Amino acid sequence: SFEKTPAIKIVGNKFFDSESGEQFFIKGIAYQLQETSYIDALADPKICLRDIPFLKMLGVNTLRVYAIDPTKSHDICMEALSAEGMYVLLDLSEPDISINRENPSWDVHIFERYKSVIDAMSSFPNLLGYFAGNQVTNDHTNTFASPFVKAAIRDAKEYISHSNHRKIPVGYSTNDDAMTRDNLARYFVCGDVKADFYGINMYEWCGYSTYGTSGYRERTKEFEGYPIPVFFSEFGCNLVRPRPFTEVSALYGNKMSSVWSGGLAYMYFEEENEYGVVKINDNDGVDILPDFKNLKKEFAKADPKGITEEESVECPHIAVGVWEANEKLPETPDRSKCACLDEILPCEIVPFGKYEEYFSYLCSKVDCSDILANGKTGEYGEFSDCSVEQKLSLQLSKLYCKIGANDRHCPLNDKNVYFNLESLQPCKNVFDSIRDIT
Ligand SMILES: OC[C@H]1O[C@@H](O[C@@H]2[C@@H](O)[C@H](O[C@@H]3[C@@H](O)[C@@H](O[C@@H]4[C@@H](O)[C@H](O[C@@H]5[C@@H](O)[C@H](O)O[C@H](CO)[C@H]5O)O[C@H](CO)[C@H]4O)O[C@H](CO)[C@H]3O)O[C@H](CO)[C@H]2O)[C@H](O)[C@@H](O)[C@@H]1O
Ligand SMILES: *[C@H]1O[C@H](CO)[C@@H](O)[C@H](O[C@@H]2O[C@H](CO)[C@@H](O)[C@H](O[C@@H]3O[C@H](CO)[C@@H](O)[C@H](O[C@@H]4O[C@H](CO)[C@@H](O)[C@H](O)[C@H]4O)[C@H]3O)[C@H]2O)[C@H]1O
């Protein structure tokens, strides 16, 4: 039963309870513990059922979760959250499968991860939204990663649209770098593809600050009229402790409630970074920290005055060293096309420092244009959406064919290289593409 959490929908630049029609404001906290490299607390009832009572005391209605394991069940925890009126904002990526901001790709491997999370989590009415990326671009040196994130938003949205699932919105979470902030926010609502909502990591308010002096007034004037819901994906600067959380009074106050859809405190668990409101002891029990009462009191005080439901933008121009995100986006990764490489290529490589070494080597012998992806120029190779191993295998196979010894000896020395016997057996279009490529 999900009665206490009606699905939230988006109308204009606001969230609304789909049953009541009242504006929904996020009063949230980040909930993530640091087998899989990440820990999925929502897959383990002994963890989530310990914490929900404290989350209830805090007064939160939303958790932000950075990584789930899609191979595990989540209904116990999601139902337990619903019973307390709590929703989940969830990233689609995980640290080891996270668009690489320094070497960006939007490919079948990352897309498969995204689909897996969508198929694991979309049945829950209290799944508020998905993040298709989190601070990928983070300064003026890696703005070219943003077209890859936009492609991911488009493709996650399309995958959801074509699925039988409720049309859970797909958004983006960004940092607060002064040089890139404005351009990023415009980019994610520009042209033909838009984020559904937008979260900003917001640490401008530290200790006993004010609306005017923190920078909140400037950010609020900045986002006034923004076409999609906007909120703080993180808040809780820890410069002064115990954190007063007096920013909460401002965020849900009259001047900010008309622009922002609330925010999520960072974070629940105390870990090496010192941002918790609770600490898990040696006995796996919850010890409440000095911050907890302050957040609780502020959330309890917060009463945002909302409206009721009944009541294309130009992309930033390109400038070298300032903004290098092309409006033109990578294509939707094509699992079938890429899977036909596994079938027809003579020389294959099992997944692995070696990528950079081997691409350097192979791309000195054959033309790697077909696997390159350039977010600055909007030039994306025909097989740039395949997995890194598929891309490497393509180049190795091209070299094998160029040598033409046809002796089943693949021209790269590595235990991970093998000749593909399936290649000898008598995907038609991909074959034509690859046969053409030789
Ligand atoms: O670095 C790891 C971390 O980085 C994040 O991205 C950051 C981003 O948060 C950052 O945003 C800038 C804010 O820090 C902002 O904050 C200023 C605030 O710190 C300052 O505090 C006062 C303090 O200086 C004083 O001594 O004592 C008083 C006590 O009351 C404090 O209030 O107050 C300023 C105004 O008075 C306030 O602006 O400043 C700028 C301008 O808005 C923000 O851009 O920018 C970083 C560098 O560009 C950026 O890397 C990520 O989100 C996170 O994931 C990473 O882990
Ligand atoms: C906001 O600021 C606080 C404190 O200043 C900071 O600790 C937060 O950092 C997040 O904390 C979480 C743990 O509490 C982490 O899970 C989280 O990490 C990020 O999670 C996303 C979601 O799964 C992944 O996509 C990240 O993975 C990296 O992604 C980048 C961009 O795609 C890639 O370049 C990297 O290859 C990849 O590792 C991941 O680190 C963490 O961000 C702040 O959000």
Side-chain angles (χ1 to χ4, degrees), residues 135 175-178 181 201 203-204 206 213-214 219 239:
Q135 45 197 121
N175 68 337
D176 190 28
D177 172 71
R181 193 200 290 118
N201 291 353
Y203 293 111
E204 290 175 26
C206 303
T213 64
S214 62
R219 302 293 82 72
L239 178 63

Side-chain angles (χ1 to χ4, degrees), residues 29-30 202-203 206 234-239 241 243 245 265-279 289 291-292 295:
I29 193 163
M202 181 52 57
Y203 293 111
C206 303
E234 285 162 39
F235 69 89
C237 174
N238 71 351
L239 178 63
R241 284 162 78 242
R243 287 179 291 185
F245 286 113
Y266 188 88
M267 61 159 299
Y268 179 74
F269 295 110
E270 170 75 5
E271 303 188 312
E272 42 197 69
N273 59 352
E274 243 148 72
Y275 275 101
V277 294
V278 310
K279 163 80 169 177
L289 303 173
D291 275 5
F292 193 103
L295 185 54

Side-chain angles (χ1 to χ4, degrees), residues 113-166:
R113 162 69 194 186
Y114 280 35
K115 291 170 176 172
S116 287
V117 174
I118 288 165
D119 291 332
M121 302 299 296
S122 293
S123 74
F124 308 110
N126 64 324
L127 206 309
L128 175 58
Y130 294 121
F131 286 120
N134 176 48
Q135 45 197 121
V136 186
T137 294
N138 61 14
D139 66 24
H140 76 118
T141 76
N142 51 35
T143 66
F144 49 82
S146 292
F148 297 91
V149 187
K150 271 193 103 171
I153 288 167
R154 176 197 64 209
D155 294 335
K157 281 169 66 166
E158 179 53 32
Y159 184 78
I160 290 166
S161 176
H162 185 65
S163 81
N164 287 141
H165 305 305
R166 180 174 58 89

Side-chain angles (χ1 to χ4, degrees), residues 67-206:
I68 63 102
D69 183 343
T71 74
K72 309 278 204 199
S73 179
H74 298 86
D75 54 356
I76 289 167
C77 295
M78 291 299 288
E79 296 180 17
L81 285 167
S82 181
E84 301 297 348
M86 291 173 193
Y87 293 79
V88 178
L89 278 160
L90 172 64
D91 301 69
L92 292 172
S93 62
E94 63 102 328
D96 289 343
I97 308 181
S98 18
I99 299 165
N100 182 321
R101 71 179 62 86
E102 294 301 332
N103 180 22
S105 179
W106 176 238
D107 61 53
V108 291
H109 181 66
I110 310 169
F111 193 21
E112 287 326 289
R113 162 69 194 186
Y114 280 35
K115 291 170 176 172
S116 287
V117 174
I118 288 165
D119 291 332
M121 302 299 296
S122 293
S123 74
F124 308 110
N126 64 324
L127 206 309
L128 175 58
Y130 294 121
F131 286 120
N134 176 48
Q135 45 197 121
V136 186
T137 294
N138 61 14
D139 66 24
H140 76 118
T141 76
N142 51 35
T143 66
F144 49 82
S146 292
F148 297 91
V149 187
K150 271 193 103 171
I153 288 167
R154 176 197 64 209
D155 294 335
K157 281 169 66 166
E158 179 53 32
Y159 184 78
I160 290 166
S161 176
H162 185 65
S163 81
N164 287 141
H165 305 305
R166 180 174 58 89
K167 304 321 170 195
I168 299 170
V170 178
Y172 181 66
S173 181
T174 192
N175 68 337
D176 190 28
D177 172 71
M179 194 178 183
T180 55
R181 193 200 290 118
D182 283 0
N183 282 156
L184 281 158
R186 187 145 60 100
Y187 187 69
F188 279 98
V189 295
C190 81
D192 297 320
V193 173
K194 303 154 205 70
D196 293 329
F197 56 84
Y198 196 74
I200 178 158
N201 291 353
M202 181 52 57
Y203 293 111
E204 290 175 26
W205 183 306
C206 303

Side-chain angles (χ1 to χ4, degrees), residues 337-338 341-342 344-349 359 362-363 366-372 381-402 411 430 433-438:
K337 174 193 70 194
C338 295
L341 289 178
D342 305 335
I344 74 143
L345 292 178
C347 293
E348 305 270 11
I349 306 156
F359 277 121
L362 292 177
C363 299
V366 292
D367 184 358
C368 289
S369 296
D370 55 14
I371 59 159
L372 300 184
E382 178 184 7
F383 294 98
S384 64
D385 59 307
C386 297
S387 73
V388 190
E389 304 80 20
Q390 287 169 339
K391 290 178 185 156
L392 226 211
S393 300
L394 175 55
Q395 307 311 318
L396 180 59
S397 288
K398 284 157 74 184
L399 187 59
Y400 172 77
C401 292
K402 193 148 68 43
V430 189
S433 296
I434 300 302
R435 190 77 182 271
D436 193 54
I437 269 148
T438 299

